[PDB]
Design a binder for this molecule. Structure first.
Ligand SMILES: *[C@@H]1O[C@H](CO)[C@@H](O[C@@H]2O[C@H](CO)[C@@H](O[C@@H]3O[C@H](CO[C@H]4O[C@H](CO)[C@@H](O)[C@H](O)[C@@H]4O)[C@@H](O)[C@H](O[C@H]4O[C@H](CO)[C@@H](O)[C@H](O)[C@@H]4O)[C@@H]3O)[C@H](O)[C@H]2NC(C)=O)[C@H](O)[C@H]1NC(C)=O
Ligand SMILES: CC(=O)N[C@H]1[C@H]([C@H](O)[C@H](O)CO)O[C@@H](P(=O)(O)O)C[C@@H]1O
Ligand SMILES: *[C@@H]1O[C@H](CO)[C@@H](O)[C@H](O)[C@H]1NC(C)=O
Ligand SMILES: *[C@@H]1O[C@H](CO)[C@@H](O)[C@H](O)[C@H]1NC(C)=O
Ligand SMILES: *[C@@H]1O[C@H](CO)[C@@H](O)[C@H](O)[C@H]1NC(C)=O
Ligand SMILES: [Ca+2]
Length: 388
């Protein structure tokens, strides 16, 4: 078994085609299904798995009540083959209320974080064994990607951050080999805030589109040099803009260099990826809430500041249904490396007050160079049938 080096062109894509859906919440009304949030997907070189951070309880369980909280000692990282729902036979891989996993070609890496907010700890579990750990460096909630990491030639990269949510913070990029931290680089370039990065290979580098929870509704970009460990950061050029809350396609901007300061506070994990000068991206259909989800191509949205020439749009979830986080994952084809994405469909507490829990389902698409149609694929549950 050789290490993944991901050195193949990026497949030319025309849009994305449906790929998987787990119908988690619908099943929960008549089955024992894990309560989860912040899910994601990653594939080794043979099959794809679906991860999620559970809430140490099933839905039809009094313990689900008040699962709106993001960090309790009972959250663990669940892992199943893509498509099999989180039922009782699912393996809890580690203790973690924030995580990230990737396969380097020979084994899985799982960075798991738990602990007190002011003094959390992250364990780096590789190939089944705990190989290394690190502690909070800014005593204020050590957090990471919430999506897949990436490895080239045996070296994996995971961007992490400790600090303020809506304030300056400390973002570093750990370089890990076989579970062992072999280098740590600090964020450089012009990105103000970096959280929940959605990274992907780009031989010989890795590129990420993250979340700015402080001053920007445009998304930050983090470029990682696997060779010398140098970092660089910017914001995506597109004037279309992918964070939530955001401005309005009409009155929204991005200069490629700084937080646009337009409805900058708060956000949502998301993705985007480059294609020559164009950019592929997705985002909630609403600008205020996490409702609906669409994807499209912004002609010259990677290279030219403020571009808004959109085309090839697809609605994944209609504007009347809930969505949530979302991220990207790469799969190696025979001749090129393709890009896919999943989208979390949060249901429950916060927006929906009939029930007392909070959970999610998922729907996942992959790029295609072929043809495709139209549709919409939401969570699907009826809050009125649900327990609680
Ligand atoms: C964030 O998380 C880290 C890692 O857990 C915490 O650091 C550890 O803190 C504990 C508690 O202080 C350390 O364990 C204790 O070590 C003491 C000795 O260290 C001092 O004294 C020696 C004397 O030779 C010096 O060499 C050394 O430099 C220190 O000055 C022990 O005395 C402690 O035992 C006593 O206290 C405990 C309660 O604290 C009692 O219950 C015991 O009965 C006993 O009386 C204890 O063993 C530990 O070593 C630290 N880690 C490391 C790597 O050093 C942080 O405290 C935490 N931060 C926050 C904000 O929560
Ligand atoms: C480690 C951690 O707490 N992650 C949480 C993250 C942070 O709150 C923001 O990243 C602020 O920095 O966001 C929430 P969200 O529902 O969007 O509010 C879900 C995550 O559990
Ligand atoms: C990438 O890996 C394959 C085998 O895994 C090898 O044939 C190819 O030459 C490698 N390319 C680089 C740039 O390492
Ligand atoms: C859920 O918890 C709250 C307080 O923790 C309580 O008031 C409420 O009645 C609970 N409801 C159910 C249905 O468990
Ligand atoms: C991966 O390995 C090949 C073969 O050893 C090497 O030439 C290539 O540059 C490596 N790539 C990176 C990004 O280290
Ligand atoms: Ca923001």
């Amino acid at each position: 078994v050789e290490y993944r080096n991901w050195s193949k062109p990026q497949c030319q894509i025309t849009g994305f085609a449906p790929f998987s859906k787990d119908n988690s919440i619908r099943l929960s009304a008549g089955g024992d299904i894990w309560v989860t949030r912040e899910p994601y997907v990653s594939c080794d070189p043979v099959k794809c798995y679906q991860f999620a951070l559970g809430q140490g309880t099933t839905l039809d369980n009094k313990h689900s009540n008040d699962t709106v909280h993001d960090r309790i000692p009972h959250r663990t990282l669940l892992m199943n083959e893509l498509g099999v729902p989180f039922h009782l036979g699912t393996r809890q891989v580690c203790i973690a209320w924030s995580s990230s996993s990737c396969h380097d070609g020979k084994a899985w890496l799982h960075v798991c974080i738990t602990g007190d907010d002011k003094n959390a700890t992250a364990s780096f579990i590789y190939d089944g064994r705990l190989v290394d750990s690190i502690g909070s460096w800014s005593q204020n909630i050590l957090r990471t990607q919430e999506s897949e990491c990436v490895c080239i030639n045996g070296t994996c990269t995971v961007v992490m951050t400790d600090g303020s949510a809506s304030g300056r913070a400390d973002t570093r990029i750990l370089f890990i080999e076989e579970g062992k931290i072999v280098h740590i680089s600090p964020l450089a370039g012009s990105a103000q805030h970096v959280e929940e990065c959605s990274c992907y290979p780009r031989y010989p580098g890795v590129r990420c589109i993250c979340r700015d929870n402080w001053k920007g509704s445009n998304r930050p970009v983090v470029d990682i040099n696997m060779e010398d460990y140098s970092i660089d950061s910017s914001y995506v050029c597109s004037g279309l803009v992918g964070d939530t809350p955001r401005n309005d396609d009409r009155s929204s901007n991005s200069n490629c260099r700084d937080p646009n300061n337009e409805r900058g506070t708060q956000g949502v994990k998301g993705w985007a990826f480059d294609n020559g000068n164009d950019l592929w991206m997705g985002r909630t259909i609403s600008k205020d809430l996490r409702s609906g989800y669409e994807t499209f191509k912004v002609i010259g949205g990677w290279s030219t500041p403020n571009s808004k020439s959109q085309i090839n749009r697809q609605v994944i979830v209609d504007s009347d249904n809930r969505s949530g986080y979302s991220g990207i994952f790469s799969v190696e084809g025979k001749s090129c490396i393709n890009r896919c994405f999943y989208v979390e469909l949060i249901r429950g507490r916060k927006q929906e007050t009939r029930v007392w829990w909070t959970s999610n389902s998922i729907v996942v698409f992959c790029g295609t160079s072929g043809t495709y149609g139209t549709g919409s694929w939401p969570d699907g549950a009826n809050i009125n049938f649900m327990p609680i």
